[PDB]
Amino acid sequence: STVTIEYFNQKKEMTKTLEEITRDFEKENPKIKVKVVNVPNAGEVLKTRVLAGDVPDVVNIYPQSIELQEWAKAGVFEDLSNKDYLKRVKNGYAEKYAVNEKVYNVPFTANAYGIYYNKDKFEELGLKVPETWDEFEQLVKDIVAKGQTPFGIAGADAWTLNGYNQLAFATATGGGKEANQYLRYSQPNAIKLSDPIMKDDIKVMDILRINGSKQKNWEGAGYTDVIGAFARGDVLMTPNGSWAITAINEQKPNFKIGTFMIPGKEKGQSLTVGAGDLAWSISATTKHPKEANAFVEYMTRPEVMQKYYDVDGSPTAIEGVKQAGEDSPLAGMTEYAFTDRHLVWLQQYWTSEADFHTLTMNYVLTGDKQGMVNDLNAFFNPMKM
Ligand SMILES: OC[C@H]1O[C@H](OC[C@H]2O[C@H](O[C@]3(CO)O[C@H](CO)[C@@H](O)[C@@H]3O)[C@H](O)[C@@H](O)[C@@H]2O)[C@H](O)[C@@H](O)[C@H]1O
Ligand SMILES: [Cl-]
């Protein structure tokens, strides 16, 4: 009378560690087994299963998503508000994604977005982390003229740049609420190529188009390709999120990594963006409800969470977990974690995000401003009614 449950993982960089933590939990609960299910196109495979009443027992679902918000409200996930382990979460970080004042997702860690950069290279080239858009332009051009490739872009994998272009409007208007007031809660067809906002977005994106700025053959490079380039010193920087660090450390790079926040028009305006990263919610219809809380309770134990945080490094929201000094790789992208400088993903209030990813990458692969401005309105007009 052993009972198997599914945990529906969407965090791929971290599968080998999550499988280990799972074996340690099956070893201490010898009457429980746990399927770790990592599928392709998880976002969608999960959307199918949920409409079809087949929700996996524990699900890794990102807590700012519409899907979560909708499904929470339609009773698909258990109310966790009045669980004990939930007390081990801090920064009122469960309640930052409450739905009708009820918590439905334990957000263990929270991700962030920024540029990764080779510290050793930058040292060798007399170059410094940038603090204005202008300095950042001039950075990229200074690397080109010193014979090296500034950026590794994953031109097949449009999502890697979602956080970038968000941060572009974000720093461009003052923050998240303001960006969405520009893009989303404005009139239909509002977004024009002439808006000063729109002109800054394009200034910030255009940094990724500076002549000589991307690696040979980037247009078909994926995540892992770019991760390999950065790791080898083939490229000096890559815009991406805290989740990549694990994959970057795997390839055993021969230089110390830094990160930085994408900057504003002026000094001190920089931002990062992100939300719960390792974040779990429990089926309201799981056949085995007690086992599912046992898995989740386990993940909150600070000595278990340390095993995970030691491989992944995204900053964590659980009590008792030694965080790293400011000499960490992620030190500069996650400095401001859990402050009013860590915006929640803009797509919180959107109906989807694929078409945003796409139009971002398309601009970097085409350079077409009116086309991108048009594409922005084509994406947001369905939402404004
Ligand atoms: O960056 C856009 C993405 O950021 C947030 O997701 C965190 C998540 O990002 C990556 O995961 C994948 C890899 O493609 O992206 C989609 C989610 O849009 C997932 O189906 C897929 O696993 C990293 O691979 C993960 O390590 C990390 O957890 C945000 O939650 C997403 O909505 C989206 O904005
Ligand atoms: Cl989507």
User: Beta 237-241 vs 58-60: how paired, if at all?
Assistant: unpaired
Task: Enumerate the H helices of 102-254 as residue ranges.
Answer: 119-124, 133-145, 162-173, 176-183, 196-206, 223-232, 244-250
Question: Does the CB atom of residue 312 touch ligand 1 within 6 A?
Answer: no
Separation of CA 183 and ligand 1 centre (Å)? 21
- Break the chain into its structural domains and give their ranges: 1-112+276-330, 113-275+331-385
Nearest ligand 1 atom, CA 43: 20
Domain 1-112+276-330 has CATH 3.40.50.10860: no
Choose one of 8, 10, 242, 308 to mutate for the ligand 1 pocket test, by most ligand atoms within 8 angstroms of C-beta: 10
Q: Which amino acid is at 266?
A: E
Cα separation values, 124 from 65, 136, 239, 286, Å: 42, 18, 21, 56
Residue 212: DSSP 8-state: T
Method used experimentally: X-ray
CB–CB of 171/264 below 8 Å? yes
Give the Cα-Cα-Cα angle 356, 361, 365 (nearest 5 degrees). 150
Q: Which class does domain 113-275+331-385 fall in?
A: alpha beta
CB–CB of 271/170 below 8 Å? yes
Task: Enumerate the H helices of 259-322 as residue ranges.
Answer: 289-300, 302-312
Which residues have CB under 8 Å from 157's CB, separation 6+? 221, 222, 223, 226
* 113-275+331-385 and 1-112+276-330 share a CATH fold: yes
- Burial code (b: 16+ CB inside 10 Å, e: under 16) for 241-276 equals bbbbbbbbeeeebeeebbbbbbbbeeeebbbbbbbb
- Nearest-CA neighbor of 209 among 269, 260, 161? 161
Give the three-class secondary structure for 343. Answer: strand
CA distance 45 to 136: 39
CB–CB of 152/229 below 8 Å? yes
CB–CB of 344/337 below 8 Å? no
CB atoms under 10 Å from CB of 74, counted, come to 10
- Measured in degrees and rounded to the nearest 5, phi and psi for residue 259 equal -130, 165
Separation of CA 316 and ligand 1 centre (Å)? 17
CA distance 142 to 144: 5
- Supply the angle between the helices 133-145 and 196-206 in degrees, to the nearest 10: 30
Nearest ligand 1 atom, CA 14: 26
- Measured in degrees and rounded to the nearest 5, phi and psi for residue 380 equal -80, -15
CB–CB of 197/173 below 8 Å? yes
Greatest distance between any 2 Cα atoms in the chain: 68
178 class by beta-carbon count within 10 Å (0-12 exposed, 13-18 middle, 19+ buried): middle
- Nearest-CA neighbor of 319 among 92, 108, 106, 89? 89
Going across the sheet that includes 113-118, the strands are 237-241, 113-118, 257-260
CB–CB of 45/38 below 8 Å? no
CA distance 34 to 57: 10
CA distance 244 to 115: 11
Q: What is the dihedral of CA 38, 44, 50, 53, to 10 degrees?
A: -80
Separation of CA 189 and ligand 2 centre (Å)? 22
Output the residue whose Cα is nearest ligand 1's atom 3: 159
